[PDB]
Each structure stands twice: as structure tokens, then as C-alpha cells.
Amino acid sequence: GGAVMYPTKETAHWKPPPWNDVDPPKDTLVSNLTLNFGPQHPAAHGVLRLVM
Amino acid sequence: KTLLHKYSDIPEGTECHRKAYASTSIGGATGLIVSAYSIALKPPASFLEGVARTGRYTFTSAAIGAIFGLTSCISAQVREKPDDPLNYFIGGCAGGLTLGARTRSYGIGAAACAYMGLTAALVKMGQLEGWQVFAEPKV
Amino acid sequence: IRLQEDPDPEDENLYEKNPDSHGYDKDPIVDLWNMRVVFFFGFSIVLVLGSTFVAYLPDYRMQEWARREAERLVKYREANGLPLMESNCFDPNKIQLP
Amino acid sequence: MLKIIIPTTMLLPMTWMSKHNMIWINATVHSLLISLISLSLLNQLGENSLNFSLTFFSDSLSAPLLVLTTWLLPLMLMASQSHLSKETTTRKKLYITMLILLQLFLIMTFTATELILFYILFEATLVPTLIIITRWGNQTERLNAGLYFLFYTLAGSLPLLVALVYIQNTTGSLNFLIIHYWSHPLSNSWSNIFMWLACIMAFMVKMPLYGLHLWLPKAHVEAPIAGSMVLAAVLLKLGGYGMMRITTILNPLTNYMAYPFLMLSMWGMIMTSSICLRQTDLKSLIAYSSVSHMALVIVAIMIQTPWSFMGATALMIAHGLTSSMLFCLANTNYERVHSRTMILARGLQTLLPLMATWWLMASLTNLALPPSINLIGELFIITASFSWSNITIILMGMNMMITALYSLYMLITTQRGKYTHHINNIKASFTRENALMALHILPLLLLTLNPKMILGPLY
Amino acid sequence: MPLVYMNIIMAFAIALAGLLMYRSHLMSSLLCLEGMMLSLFIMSTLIILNTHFTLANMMPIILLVFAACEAALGLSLLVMVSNTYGTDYVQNLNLLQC
Amino acid sequence: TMMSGRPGRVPLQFLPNEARSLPPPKLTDPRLVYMGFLGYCSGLIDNAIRRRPVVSAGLHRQLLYVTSFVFFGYYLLKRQDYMYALRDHDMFAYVKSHPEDFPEKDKKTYGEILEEFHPVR
Amino acid sequence: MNPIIYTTLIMTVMSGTMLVMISSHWLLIWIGFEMNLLAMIPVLMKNFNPRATEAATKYFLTQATASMMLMMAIIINLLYSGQWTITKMFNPVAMTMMTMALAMKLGLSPFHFWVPEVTQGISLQAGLLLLTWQKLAPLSVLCQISQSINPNLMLTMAMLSILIGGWGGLNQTQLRKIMAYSSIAHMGWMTAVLPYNTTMTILNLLIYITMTLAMFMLLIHSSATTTLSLSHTWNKMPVITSLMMVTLLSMGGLPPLSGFMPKWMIIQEMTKNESIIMPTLMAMTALLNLYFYMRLAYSSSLTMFPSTNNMKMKWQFEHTKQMKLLPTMIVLSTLVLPMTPALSSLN
Amino acid sequence: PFFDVQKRLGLDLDRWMTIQSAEQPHKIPGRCHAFEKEWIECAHGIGGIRAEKECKIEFDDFVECLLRQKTMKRLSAIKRQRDKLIKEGKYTPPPHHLGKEDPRP
Amino acid sequence: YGPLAFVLGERTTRKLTETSKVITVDGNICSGKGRLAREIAEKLGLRHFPEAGIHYADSTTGDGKPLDVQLSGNCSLEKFYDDPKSNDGNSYRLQSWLYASRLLQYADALEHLLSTGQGVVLERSIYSDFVFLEAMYRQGFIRKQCVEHYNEVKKVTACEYLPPHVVVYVDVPVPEIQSRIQKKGNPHEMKITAAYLQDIENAYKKTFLPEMSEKCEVLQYSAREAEDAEKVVEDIEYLKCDKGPWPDQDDRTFHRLRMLVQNKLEVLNYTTIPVYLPEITIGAHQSDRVFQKFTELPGRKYSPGYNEDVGDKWIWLK
């Protein structure tokens, strides 16, 4: 029932493959770019620091 | 192939030093190839570690080749029977003992003696009888 | 560690249900007919009829034929003074030595 | 030969389409009739073999073995009835089908006229035997025993396949008749030496040779009763048949190459007979005795003399019968007490008198009490070896003494002494078991009256 | 063979070595594949032009078409790998082993 | 290799017109009967896999199995015979065309030939 | 994937193989290989998993490198000969490069590392396509160029393939990886006879395809990807596991099963050419494949492993989908030995 | 497994580009059309095994036309000899080679 | 249904309508959920599936009469009530078998909805089954490893199917449920502890209701409110759950789901995952005996329609 027969010490720790699918490793993989739209921006009316 | 030609060209049971040198070169080449494959497949942690592994494998292979050639040629000289496979068997068992010493294990030494000596005797027999490991297609 | 049925007791003696079990099965009729088939077709047929067949098998090994031929050859050779058994299996003349 | 082959093949549809009640009865009846048909093959022309067809031929060597196999099948069914009673109808039919396929393969192996076909059928026997051992064995070690049996035999066989193909390429034919008639002598070269080794080693493995016999104890101990019966009676004899057949090709090198196997067999017979003295399992003891007798057979084959060959054939047949009977006798005790330990069941002569007589007769045959065919074969082999070397008598006589000792030690321990008090499940022996033992014993004793039947072609 | 053939074959060898020696990113190895394709285009074009194989001056264009097909396949796989792991690093293609 | 480049071989032709000279395989050939047996075993295995009655269910399906296997086997046997016959034809033609390479050998009776006797002692 | 798109992609793979097997121009053969890769990559990922994407990426990288090497070999042969036709290759370096590329496509060691990983990553059906159909085109190209092939290189690759395929399988408890390693070993068997007789390679390919189709279809029927999952099958569908045991025995090469004939004929052909050591070593090394086959058989059919309570529910229902060709595939894989002389039809 | 569907159905799917001597647009000749034609005609219907040795002269001429290895080697040797003579001072290029005469139209 | 049909143009979306919905009426033991579920199915013209029991698969297969416990289920709810902590492992066998039955019922309900377009009302579902498991684990009836096995099976299996559009929870306070259990008078049920019901309620409200509310809207009714079935049906009729999976689903996903649901064995494939827990692991001998007994059951030896014993005919040409 192991992942590999005749397992070694390192492989023994390794878990067997998932039955259906691998778990999603979603962990802060996408970091949205943060932009200071203003104040100096022409479209910010000069005094708006829109953090987007 | 030049190393194999070098080992073959020296007459059996003669110029034992040159035969031993050729066997050592062959062993070193085989060890270098094995070390390259080991480094690729199983990565070494450091460049120094890779160099150490290469040196260990290469020296083991070269020692095996040198012992095989030296013992085989010396046995051929002393017995004075050039074409006997027993000389190759003795050389192969000596190589296996050298491998056991390098691995610091008696069991490796004995198993290597048996298998390697038998393989070397078979190689000598193939030389004598013209056995072809790779046969040109003739049908 | 698992849900498994208790080990079955030693297989029930066929004698208990049928004292004259004869073995060969649980059902007595099949037991009797199995015993009858075995006894007939091996002992009565194969052993006795087969043994008789082997005993009177025609002598195709030519033992009697060999004996008769040897008797004829011995009588002829002794009558004619020829040696009883010639030392050469094949006539020397036909052989061409190197 | 189709007179025997086709009915054996029809045995399978009958078994599969038979009623659940009637499987054993039909199989036994028709197998016995087939055995009766096989008795016709015993009539052999002295000079020439019975060449039925291009594919199949029979001689004074193959005929006895074919008769033995056909006889063995019904005894195997009778023995296997008891422990397969609980099994479902489909599994019982599959077991019978495996036995029938094994008989068909063995018959074709013995009657085959081409060495390549002989190889195909001789290796094919592994599959049904492996399935029997590893599916209907009663111990966890049945799988390891199956692996050992299969791999020992295959490692021996495959170089034989290579050698046979090479022979086909060089000589041009693998038909035994052509090979015998042409049979150019071999030369003492390393290539011919290795060809000799390749030809011999597979049969040397099949006939348990000392150092290559490890599979036999595991397989015989761990196999079901029927599988042990076939392995002892017939499957081992395939090696002897092939070695006697194959030896024609390797004429001169046999003298030079025989010494290692000759010495191994001669010393191993003593070693294994001694092993039998201190074995604690009845089946294992029987298996080691089989090993010793097959070592005698190997010596006979290697010596390559006519008397040795006649003794080898006689010993093969006699040992097959005696070892099968011994395995069945042990199996009865195993079923009653559910253990193979010799010490556990004691004093069985008081509890089961007639089985005691069966044991006595089987042991007497095992120790070669004359005029048993066992003694005839052993004596002929011993005389041939004495001609080979007068010094051989010492080892052979020592082996005879050790064989008598271990056979009568088994008889004394199992059937003599005070009964084991706690064991209460011993029940009167069934007519089936006694009938099986009688079917084993009577043909063996009868064969003494006409021993030319089992004396082989050289007779 | 002139030296330009030497240089172009050397470029192919270098690109092959680059592809076979990954470092971290997958994009770089796809670029080495595209480099190999460019080297093959140059070699084929030089051969076909020097030998005036007129009907073979289209083979480089087909080679380029299938090279771009391969490049598209590579990028479409890299996008999925990045989505599933967050980077194009080759070390993340480690679930399947042996 | 070998027969692939034989001169005059039409590509992708199962049976050349030359084969018609050879006798057709007999419908009672053992090989064709074995092909039909394979078809019957295929039908039985199909019934077993679908959990139908093994030997009685789907007689039409078993008939189709047997007929298809026999039908293909007839042509397969014909092609096999044609190929072996072509091999023999070419071999004999080559032997005739190259007499030196296949020289007739002087036949010496066993009396003339000397074969060393190795005693089994 | 819409079934129409799936049909189109599978047809594209088959059409690329057909172009490889129908074209006399090297460019078109390479185009067929490229089409095969393009169609295959989406097929391998029909079920979207991270493992499927990893397998697709590995396969793409290996096959792209093989294709680039093959194209370089073609261009070198053109440079030294000026010929595009598939025929004797007139430059030895090009022949070596082409052999390396075609071996990598076939997964011959030392280019085998990708096969088990890809096979494990993909589904059983994609595995069947990968290990049966994909092998056809490189073997066809090798057969057409057999004369130019250096026998030493092909034989070295074949022997290494046999050894590695045998060794790796011993350590595997995953059915797909076991199949991948057995495929490596059998491909090593097929390429061994390529220098000597191509018809033997074709015969071995056909027998191997039949056996692999039977095995993969049986696994799909049992829905097992691990040895333990296959172990339960005896409780639900015993006949499947019994036929699997028979097919495994055939794969091992045991007589009288049909797996024996390819090894038999390969040994015969090698022996005719004076090759004795190589056939002996190949036959002996095949025993390891037999070992892991027998272990799988022990787990599946010969011994009855423990089941689970919830299987009782599965007993009531019956398999909905029927694989029509499975019984004929089993019969051909196991019972075709008595018909070997028919190996002159493909001849 | 080269199913010659093209030959069976008489379709020239790809054979038109197989050789340099085949028909080309506007009858533009290949750089080695003559050698390729001679080699193809020599090795036609005799099989590859025979053609590899019975048409070796044709194939060598074709290869020489394709690569010019021998011609390039001879030219390099001539240039080396000319340069060595110039260094020795015992050779002087003719005025026409030096550009002192108008080349023929 | 098949891929060929989808290629031809058999599309699930057209058959589905506003009526096409999966309604799951959940609640604690003796919460009256069955009455409301039946009334909702009748008023809204939706097929009603009675709550999955030990023998639901028996109902859907063969004769439809329940089979013996050994052959189907090897678990007893009465045993669980009488002996919650039995060493036999009956508790987790019951829980896993019930999850398998509810998974099969959900597959069948989805098949009905996707084949005929009629909505389905279910009493509890695979999404709510964890409530009993958590209560059992909290009360100590089952071990943690059993909970882990249940989690693995649910994770592998539940993801494939689409959750219900409308979740109706009938809430009855636990003491009133105890009085109801006493009034019903079933001897085994009376033994149910108050803490067990309280943990059932805690699981429902703390986990099931919030998680279900995230996907779509959940209609929570008290016992008095539940009795007015017409008002519940009207509430359902005026729900607008634009958020959630079903609006996202298109014809391709429906084809995949219908193919999955039709193949019951594929639906139950991972219920038999090879995790050797003592509670649910059956030995080889007992498994063989029970399988032989199941095969001997009338109408079960061969594939449906080929069993001559139960009156099938024309097998030779069938």
C-alpha cells in the first residue's frame, strides 16, 4: 500500500498519491499590483491618492 | 575505442606494466562516466562534494582495472600459459576484492570476486572462441 | 483489525451425517456411486483387465524371434566349423581405411 | 497419440458442463478409461519407436511415463476431493481443469518428436502447477514457494531455448529421430562446453540436483496434495526424460563435463538422506528422499551406459509411485490433525490399523526391499556405477543404509509409540483414502512380475 | 563544408545544451527550443540556396510554421503550470516521480 | 527488410493474383478450425465479462464471433501460404542462378568416411 | 473537452502517425511527428489535474527535443547527400543523432525517465493511447532506416531498456508505472531485432499492443490505478482479475501463452546472426518483469485480499459501459501461439 | 510500415520535392541536376545494396558537386602555394589577375 | 445518454426550467422534515425521494425488496441506538453505508433532473450527512480515523456533483425533539441521548447552514412555520439565487455530470477506497462467503435480464 515498494528512509515519509486529484496549493500565489493613482496624476484632480 | 585497442594490442602475458596501465585507463574512463551519470541523476550538494564523488568512483574503477590487469598479466607470465581463461578469472576476483576493500565490506568483496571473475573468464573465452556480443547483421 | 468470520470448526465428519460415509461426498447416493465407480473402473477394469492385457501383450520386442534366430545361427555355425560369433560386425572389405 | 490426447481435451468440457454433484465422479471415470487406453502404448517394437505421426512418437521410455501420468490423474482427483469440498463449484471445476491441462501438457511433452515442441510443453507445465500451488495452498509460504519453483525452472530453461534454436540453425532439425541418426560428435571447446551446460542445466534443475534443489522442499511442502503428487511422480521425471533424450547430441564432452554433476549428485544423495533423518516435517522428509532418489537417477544418466539407463527408467517410475503414495499417506494425517509436524501425531497404528500397513508397504518400497522395481532400478544403477568406478559402492551403500534408516524412522515415529492423548479427532479411515493407497501400491507390486515394461528402451 | 556551416551547427549544439541544462524558469528553455528552431532554419536555408534546390526553398517556411506551433504549445503549457504553482519554475513539476 | 522490396510487389495488396495458382486452404484446415475455436472462446469471454450465461447466452453473437474469426483466418492462411511459397520459389531460383555458391558435394559412404570412436567407459 | 473536439484531436494524432507511415519525404515525416505532439498534448490533459499538466509538460519537452534532433539529422543528411527520401542515411553522425531522437520518442533507455512519470500522470485511457499508438510511428521510421542504423547503438539501447524496465517495475506499486516500465522492457525487446529482422519487430509490436490494450482495458473496467485497488476486484468482478492473471502470464512470456512467440522468434533471429550472448542475457533479464507480473497476479487473483464493507453496494449494480474489443484482445494476447507460422502475412 | 498509398493510388503527395532533379517551376535547374540524374539512373531497380557500390562513382560525383570539399581543398592548396611563393619572392601575379587588363565581356 | 447523443445535439440546458431544482429538507431527528418534503414535492410538482436508508440501493436494484443485512449493509441503526460504542464498529459502518446510500440517491436525483427536467426534493443529502458523523465523534461513538476516512471519501466523491439550489432547514428545539421521540414510542430511538441531538443541531447550524448559505440561500423554518407548506412553497417560488454554481453550469458540464450519474458504479467508485480501518474492513473469508450468498440471491447471478430463475426468457437470442 505504499507509494513505492522496497521504500527507503526518505521515501517512507513521502505520502502515496491522491486517489482522485492533488490538493490545490493556493497560498498567496497571486499578489495584486498596488498603484498610487494620485496625487500628481493628471486624472486624480491633484489631491487624490487612490490606492488601487 | 582507442583504450580498448591499447589493451588488446599488448600481447597477453607480456609487458605487464603496459597492460596494467591500459586496464587502469579503461577503469578510469568507466568511473568517469559513472560519476557523470551519478552527478546528473543524484545532484551533489556542492562542487567539492561532486569532485569528491567523482574522485571516489574514478579511483575505485581505476584500482579495479589496475589490479585486474596486473594480476592477470603476472599470472599469465608466471604460469606461462597465455591463453588460459583462469588468468582472467584470477584478475577478476582480485578486482572484486579491491572493490570490496574500497567499499569496506567483505560481502561486496566476495560477491564481486565471484561474479567479476566469472565475467572476465567469459570475456577471455569469447576472445579465444570468437564470441560476438554485438553481431553484424548477416542472416 | 478486520471483521472476519470465525474459523470454521474442523470440517464435519461425513460419518456423523452418514455413518457409512464412504467419503467422496456429503450426499450418500453420490458417495456410494463414487465408491462404485472408483472400485469398478480402477480395480476391476484397469488393474485386472489392464494387467491381463499387459501380460499377454504380443511379443513385438522380438525376444522369441531373436532366440529362434540365434538357435539357427548357432546350429549352422557349429555344423560348418565357423566361429560362433565373428569378431567383425561389418565385413572388412566394404570398409575403406584411410 | 490423439486417441489419448483428444479424450483428455474432452475431459475439460465434460467437467465444466457436468452437474455440481457429478464433477468428481465423471472426471474419475473418464480419466480411468483414458488410462486404460494408454496401456496400449506399452506394446513397443524392440528395434524402432512407435512413430504415430510427424509431431508425436512413443518409445519404451515415453510409454511408461505416459501411463504413469494418465494413472496419476484419477488418484489426484480422489485425493483432492476432500479438502476442496467447501470450495465453490466454479473453483472446483477450475482446479480439475488445471489438473487436466497438466496431464495434456505432460502427455504431449512425452510424445513430442521435436525438441522445441518438447520445450514449449515442458515449460508450459509451470503455469498450471504454479496456479495450483499459489491458489490452493494452505500456507502463507505458498507464494514464495511458487516464486522459487517458477524462477528456478525458468532460469534453467531459457538458455536451453537458446541452445535448441542454435541447434536448429546448425544441424537444421530438432526432430529426435534425425538428431539421433546424424548425431555428429561434439568437440572440446568452450562454446561446446557452454552448449552442453545449457542443454543439461534445465533438466538438472527439474530433477532436483544438490545445490539446485531448494525449490523442491518449499514447493512440495506448501503445495496441495494433488500438486505434490504430480511434482513428485511426473514433473521431476521430465528432467530425466529430457536428459536421456538430450544426451545424444553431447556425446564426447559428457565424459569431461559429467564429473561436477556426478560428484554433486553422489555426495548430495548422502547429504539429503542424512537431512531426512533430522527433519521435523513429514512432507519435507518425503521431498528430501525424492531428491536423493533423483540424484541416483542423475548419476545413472550421466554415466551413459545401457544398464544405467534401464535403472534410471525403472527408478523414475517406481519413485513416482512411491513418493505419490507417501505424500497421500502424510496428507491423510495432516487432514486429521491439521499439522505436518511428525512428533505431533504418534501411535497411529493402534488408531488406524490398515493405514499402518499402507505406510509399511510404502516405506519398504522407499527403502528398496526386493523384488521391488525401486530395488531393480537402484541395483542396476549401482552396478553401472561400480563399472564406472568400484569406489562408487561406498557412497551408494551408505545412501541405501541412510534411506532405510530414515524410512523406518518415519514409520516408527508416526505409526508407533503411545497415541497422543489430547488428539481426539482421529476417525476411521475412509474407503476413499484406502482405495487411493491401494491404487498406488498394487500397480507397483504388479510391475515387478513384468519388469521389462518399466526397464526402458535399452532393454 | 565552409565555416558558416560550422558556426550554425555550433549554435544548434549550444541551444540543445541550454535546453538540456535547465536552471529554474521554463520560459528560458522554451527560448532555447526556439533558438534551436532558428538555427535549423538558417542551416536549411543555406543548404537549399547553395544547392539551388528551388522546390525546397519552402521547407524552411514549413519548419518555421511548425516551430511556432511548438512554441504556442509550450507557452500554453507554461501558463497552466504558472497558474497551478504561481511560478514557471521547473522544480514544481515534481509530483510525478521516477 | 527481406521480402519487402521484392520486385513487382504491388503496395498494400493482401493477396497478389499470383497466389491464385497455389491451392486454396481447405475449409477443414486445422488452423482455420483453431481460429474458429478462438472465436468461440472470444464469445464465451464476452458473456463472462458482461455477466451473461457463459455457454447459452447470445448464440447469434457467438456465431458472429466464430464466423468473423474463420473468415479472417481463411485469408490469413492463404497469405501465409503465398508468402512461404514465394520464399521457396526465390530460394530455388537463387540456387539455380548461382551454382558455384551451392555446389553439389561428393557423396561418400560411411565405409569411406572416418569418424572417431569415443568409448563410453 | 467537447466530444467532437476529442474525436478531432484523436484523429489528428492518428493522422500524424499515418503521415509518418505514408510519407517518402523526411520533411513530411517530421511534420507528422509534430502533428502527433500537437494533438497529443491536449489529449493527455483531458482530465485537468496538476499531475496531468506536469505530465503534459514533461512529454512536450522530451518530444520537442527529440523532434529538433531529428530535424538536425535530416538537415545534415541533406547537406551531405542532397536527398529528402527516407532511405539509407549517408552520414554517420546524422544516423547517430536520428537514432537518439527516435529512441527518445520511443522511450528507449537512457531516455526512459519520462515514460513512467507521464504514464502515472495521465489517465488509463490516455495511458493506453500513449503506450500503444504512439510507439507505432518511431518504430516505423526505425524500420525504414534499419539498414543505416549502427547495430551496436540500437542493441545497447535495447539491452539497457530491458534491464531498466525490469528493475524499475520491481519497486512499483502503482499499476500505471508498472505498465510504463514493462513497456520500456518490451520496446527494448522490439528494437533488439530491428538491425536483424524488421518483421520480428512488427510481430512483437502487434503482440505487445494486443497485450497492453487488454491490460489497460481490464484496468479501466476495474477502475484500479494501484495494486490495493486492484486487490478488491476479486470481490466484485472475479472474472476480470482472472483474465488479468492470464494476460500477465502472457506478458511475462511464459509458454504456451502468446507472449512467448515474440521472444521465441527474436531469439531465433538473433541466433541465426550468431548472436548468442545477447539473446541469453535478454531472456534472463526478462525474468524480473515476470517477477513483478507474478506479484501483481498474487495480489489480484491468486490470493484474496481483504475487501471493504461498502463493496456490498457495488455488487448490486452492473458495469454500464462495454469495451467491445476486450474479449478478442484477451484471446489474441493469450491463445495465439499455435498460429505463429502466420507471421509471414505482415511479412 | 511504409504503406505506399501514394504509389497504390497514383498520388504524388510529396514525391515532387523528394529530389533536386525533379520538375521545378519554370524549369529552373538544380546546381547538381546532371550528377543527381546520373546517380538516380544508375541506381534504379538494382536495389540499395547493389547501388551502394555499383553506382559509387556517380554518388561521389554528386557529393563533390553538392559540397565541393575536394574542389575547395585543391583551391586552398593552390592559394597556400601561391602565398608561400609570394613570401619567397619567386612568384608574381599576372597583370590581368592584378586588374591591369579589362576582363572579357 | 452518450457522447454520440451530445454530438447529435442532446443538450441538458433546454430541458431544465425554473421548476428544475434540487430541494433538500434537512433537520434533526424527528424534526418533521419528511412531511414538509412530501408537501413541497406535491405542491411544486417535483419528484420526492424519501430519505436514504440502509436498503435504498436494494430499492433501486432488482426486485426492490430489502435484502438481508449481511448481504446489504452489514449495519444496524437499532444496534447503534442500543450500543453506540460497540467494539464491532457498527457505528462507522452504518455512517459510511448511509453516506454511500445518500451519494447514490443524489446521483439518481441528478439523473432524473437532467434526463426529464423535473425537480427533485430530497430529505437530507450527502452535504448534510457529516452532521451525524460529527455528533458521533463528539460523543465518542467513532474514532478520529473513521472521521478522516469519511472526510477522504467525501472529498473525492462529493466534489463531482452540483450542490442543491434550495436548502430548507426545519428547526425544532432539542427538548421538544426528545418529547417527540417519546411520543413516537420506538424503543431504540428513545435511548438517544440529549447531547447527541444537541451535537447534531450544533453541526447543522454552525457548519452546514453557513456553508450552504454561502453558495445559495437557505430557508430556515420553525416547526410551526414548516407546517404551512403552502407558504414554504411560495417562499421557494420567490427565491432568486443568481449566485451559485447552477447558473454557471453549461451544456458541457451537464454532459459530464449526466455521464457520471448514469454510471452508478463510477458514482460509488471511491466509496470502496482501500483504507484498512478495522470498522469497515471485511476479511477475505467473510467477503467470499457473503459474495457467494449475494450471487445465489434470485435474480442476481447474471446481469439483469439474463436471470432465467426470475422469469427472463430468450436468453439464447438476448
Side-chain angles (χ1 to χ4, degrees), chain G residues 6 46 50 62 69 72 80 91 96 140 151 156-157 184 199 201 224 231-232 237 249 252 262 270 287 297 323:
Chain G
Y6 190 75
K46 179 189 172 184
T62 60
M69 298 175 53
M72 189 65 245
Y80 273 89
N91 194 263
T96 54
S140 136
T156 56
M157 282 185 170
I184 306 184
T199 72
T201 97
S231 76
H232 291 15
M237 312 158 303
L249 292 184
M270 295 197 71
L287 293 178
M323 8 204 61

Side-chain angles (χ1 to χ4, degrees), chain D residues 34 110 120 159 169 177 197 213 257 274 287 312 321 327 338-339 348 359 362 392 403 441:
Chain D
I34 299 180
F110 287 130
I120 295 187
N169 300 341
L177 304 172
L197 286 173
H213 71 282
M257 297 297 300
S274 74
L321 279 176
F327 274 116
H338 295 293
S339 179
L348 297 176
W359 275 92
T392 60
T403 52
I441 259 172

Side-chain angles (χ1 to χ4, degrees), chain D residues 86 88 91 135, chain I residues 288 291-292 296:
Chain D
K86 287 187 55 183
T88 46
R91 302 196 183 95
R135 171 71 191 193
Chain I
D288 201 12
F291 185 59
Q292 303 165 353
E296 266 100 59

Side-chain angles (χ1 to χ4, degrees), chain D residues 108-150:
Chain D
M108 287 188 288
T109 62
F110 287 130
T111 48
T113 60
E114 257 259 343
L115 271 165
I116 219 55
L117 182 62
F118 167 81
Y119 174 86
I120 295 187
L121 294 167
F122 146 81
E123 280 300 284
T125 66
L126 300 184
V127 182
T129 310
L130 177 69
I131 293 183
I132 296 177
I133 300 181
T134 54
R135 171 71 191 193
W136 286 282
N138 297 347
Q139 303 288 343
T140 177
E141 301 291 319
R142 64 183 147 118
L143 314 171
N144 187 49
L147 291 179
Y148 268 66
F149 163 75
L150 180 74

Side-chain angles (χ1 to χ4, degrees), chain H residues 64-80:
Chain H
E64 178 58 11
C65 177
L66 283 182
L67 293 182
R68 295 290 180 175
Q69 294 180 353
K70 295 189 299 299
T71 304
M72 288 192 301
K73 174 183 290 69
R74 148 155 290 188
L75 294 184
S76 60
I78 292 183
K79 293 211 307 178
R80 288 173 50 89

Side-chain angles (χ1 to χ4, degrees), chain G residues 136-319:
Chain G
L136 270 157
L139 266 186
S140 136
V141 172
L142 284 177
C143 291
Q144 303 184 40
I145 71 174
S146 65
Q147 180 182 9
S148 63
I149 297 179
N150 192 11
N152 299 21
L153 173 50
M154 188 66 59
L155 289 165
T156 56
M157 282 185 170
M159 235 318 228
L160 291 185
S161 301
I162 300 184
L163 283 171
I164 290 182
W167 285 331
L170 301 185
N171 194 266
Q172 297 300 345
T173 61
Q174 308 288 323
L175 298 180
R176 289 177 284 195
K177 296 189 181 301
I178 296 179
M179 294 296 296
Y181 280 106
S182 64
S183 132
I184 306 184
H186 290 177
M187 297 301 310
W189 271 92
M190 306 174 197
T191 57
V193 265
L194 242 176
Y196 304 104
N197 194 8
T198 57
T199 72
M200 300 309 170
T201 97
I202 304 180
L203 181 76
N204 198 161
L205 181 59
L206 298 191
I207 296 296
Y208 156 89
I209 286 186
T210 56
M211 299 187 302
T212 45
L213 286 164
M215 275 292 301
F216 269 103
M217 282 188 287
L218 283 169
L219 296 180
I220 299 173
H221 193 288
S222 59
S223 67
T225 68
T226 63
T227 46
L228 264 50
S229 61
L230 189 58
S231 76
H232 291 15
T233 59
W234 75 269
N235 218 15
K236 177 177 178 56
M237 312 158 303
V239 186
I240 276 59
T241 188
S242 173
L243 305 168
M244 264 203 54
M245 186 252 302
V246 190
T247 60
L248 288 172
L249 292 184
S250 77
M251 296 183 60
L254 299 184
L257 304 181
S258 121
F260 175 63
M261 64 177 303
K263 306 186 180 306
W264 186 13
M265 300 309 182
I266 297 178
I267 297 181
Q268 170 211 35
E269 274 300 331
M270 295 197 71
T271 55
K272 293 181 183 176
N273 291 253
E274 282 84 58
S275 301
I276 309 298
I277 316 172
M278 187 93 176
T280 306
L281 295 184
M282 293 164 38
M284 296 302 299
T285 53
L287 293 178
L288 320 162
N289 293 255
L290 241 172
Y291 177 71
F292 64 71
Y293 293 143
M294 284 298 308
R295 191 175 51 198
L296 219 202
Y298 285 168
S299 46
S300 62
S301 60
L302 294 177
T303 343
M304 290 155 40
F305 277 46
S307 72
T308 51
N309 186 26
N310 296 23
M311 286 241 59
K312 297 182 177 58
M313 212 173 187
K314 302 197 66 175
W315 295 345
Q316 315 189 17
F317 303 89
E318 243 274 281
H319 226 243

